């Protein structure tokens, strides 16, 4: 059991980049998918869920209308599409198995970051 | 939303002893949809606790979660040195899921 986040990666604000959640040992298709983000030296905070297919979807006000969840069931994958990255969004960005009451987030990837920047100037 | 405070934010103890983390809730947790995890450094979230007071598979005994209503708490009966990390509370009762800000044990 196990889910491998990719797509990370330093941009610039205004940019935009796919992430992607490989998962494998479990029926992914009867799972809750979530994305949980955590800016360096903070707490976690949800980020986006999906259901089934379902296809319901749900994000925090923060991301709303700029990030995108889905998931590809015959890939066991899921995705969060990221546009109109801001510098508020940089942090490691978890993918995690949501359970319910059959576990909460008892799956989670190794994270990956995403680092929002124009390097310090233009400010 | 259902607020998460978590109190104290950092916690200084010895090996052997007891460590009592408090969870309050703004709002009553329906289902006792409540969870805890533990972060090392470097490292994801690991699930430790789930609905309130039940154990994750090949979590030790000394950690056990308590709670119902808006009061919840997480207790490491007798600290190891690896059990020394930030300790998340977690709310999955409605559709806004919400962490508490974290406490750290030292």
């Known amino acids: 059991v196990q889910l491998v986040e990719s797509g990370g990666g330093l941009v610039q604000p205004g940019g935009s980049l796919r992430l992607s959640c490989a998962a494998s040992?479990?029926?992914?298709?009867?799972?809750?998918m979530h994305w949980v983000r955590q800016a360096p030296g903070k707490g976690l905070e949800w980020v986006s869920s999906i259901w089934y297919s379902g296809s319901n979807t749900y994000y925090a006000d923060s991301v709303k209308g700029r990030f995108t969840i889905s998931r590809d069931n015959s890939k066991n994958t899921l995705y969060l599409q990221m546009n109109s990255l801001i510098a508020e969004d940089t942090a490691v960005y978890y993918c995690?198995?949501?359970?319910?009451?059959?576990?909460?987030?008892?799956?989670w990837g190794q994270g990956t970051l995403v680092t929002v920047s124009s390097g310090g100037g233009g400010s | 939303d259902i607020v998460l405070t978590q109190s104290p934010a950092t916690l200084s103890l010895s090996p052997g002893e007891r460590a009592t983390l408090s969870c309050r809730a703004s709002?009553?947790?329906?289902?006792?949809?409540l969870a805890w995890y533990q972060q090392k450094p470097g490292q994801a979230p690991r699930l430790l606790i789930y609905d309130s007071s039940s154990r994750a598979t090949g979590v030790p005994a000394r950690f056990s979660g308590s709670g119902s209503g808006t009061d919840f708490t997480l207790t490491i009966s007798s600290l190891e040195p690896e059990d020394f990390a930030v300790y998340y509370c977690?709310?999955?009762?409605?559709?806004?899921?919400?962490f508490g800000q974290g406490t750290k044990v030292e």
């Open positions: 709002q009553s947790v329906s289902s006792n949809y």
């Open positions: 995690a198995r949501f359970a319910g009451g059959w576990g909460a987030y008892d799956v």
């Open positions: 977690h709310q999955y009762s409605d559709i806004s899921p919400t």
């Open positions: 040992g479990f029926t992914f298709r009867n799972s809750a």
